[PDB]
């Protein structure tokens, strides 16, 4: 399922995702797209922080879901 | 189907798309055709802004539809 990660500049990004995937997945898959290193990046759905050992199921996220991606040092 | 872009210059140029075609797509195409990079165009529909990863289906754009181009630095 594909999904959108939108960031704090107004850009967005797809990514093509499972429900099993964890969030540390995606934030793998916004490295290699992107180069941003999973440790500076804070991931939001739904008005939740999403935590590492969970899946995108979990949290419902769902076809074409946006995501918010806010970096953090 | 052809589609066209209309320029606060007032210019319009015709673009052949597909429903499928996401922003990202028409913003190559015009990249091709007249040389502005995508990161320098806005896109805009009935209102909207248009975000990369939707497609021209999505946001009900259709035969000789007049998107709306303003150019950003």
């Given at each position: 399922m594909?999904?959108?990660?939108k960031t704090l500049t107004g850009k967005t990004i797809t990514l093509e995702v499972e429900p099993s995937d964890t969030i540390?997945?995606?934030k793998a898959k916004i490295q290699d797209?992107?180069?941003i290193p999973p440790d500076q990046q804070r991931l939001i759905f739904a008005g939740?922080?999403?935590?590492d050992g969970r899946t995108l199921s979990d949290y419902n996220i769902q076809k074409e879901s946006t995501?918010?991606?806010v970096?953090?040092?």
């Open positions: 594909q999904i959108f990660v540390e997945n995606v797209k992107e180069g939740k922080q999403l935590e995501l918010h991606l970096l953090r040092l």
